[PDB]
């Protein structure tokens, strides 16, 4: 069973192939919004706490929160809802969606780390991923870099360098 675990701050994700059946029984009779035991999910996650954030069952089906059913059902999704993106103006197409209750059919189960334990895992927590880009709004960069009303916020912005081998661009 694939366990897709995400870790904030470091911002890294990794899949753990939990073959053992005794380990994945903690997710049984659970639903997005609860917590699971790091010792229960495996031996190397001692002292860890995880929060379920959905996933997908066999054949690949989005996990929609609020279904509160252990089996898949066909729902009429609409605009501004997850698991469906309007391809037109007002178009509402119904699709089969996996239930929120986690059962013995989740091929890939998605969690997010809540707190860090004593032991550290692989690159999942051993790698630090920086942000893709900084903010754009003047007030946003002001509150980011910690300036005042009159502090010349234009100068204190992102100045990342990209080089083609003969010239550098700050962009």
């Amino acid at each position: 069973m694939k366990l897709n675990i995400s870790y904030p701050v470091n911002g890294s994700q990794k899949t753990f192939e939990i073959d053992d059946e005794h380990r994945i029984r903690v997710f049984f009779d659970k639903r997005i919004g609860q917590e699971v035991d790091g010792e229960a999910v495996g031996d190397e996650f001692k002292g860890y706490v995880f929060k379920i954030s959905g996933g997908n069952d066999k054949q690949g089906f989005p996990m929609k929160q609020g279904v509160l059913l252990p089996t898949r059902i066909k729902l009429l999704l609409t605009k501004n809802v997850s698991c469906y993106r309007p391809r037109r103006d007002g178009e509402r197409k119904r699709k089969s969606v996996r239930g929120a209750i986690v059962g013995p059919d989740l091929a890939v189960l998605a969690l997010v780390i809540v707190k860090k334990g004593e032991q550290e895992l692989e690159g999942l927590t051993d790698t630090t991923v920086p942000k893709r880009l900084g903010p754009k709004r003047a007030n946003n960069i002001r509150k980011f870099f910690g300036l005042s009303k009159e502090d010349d916020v234009r100068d204190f912005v992102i100045r990342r360098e990209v080089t083609k081998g003969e010239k550098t661009y700050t962009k």
Binding site: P8, V9, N10, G11, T128, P130, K131, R132, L133, G134, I158, R159, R160, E161
Partner: peptide, 8 residues
């Protein structure tokens, strides 16, 4: 949380 942003 505080994390580095891009190449800054």
């Amino acid at each position: 949380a505080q994390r580095p942003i891009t190449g800054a």
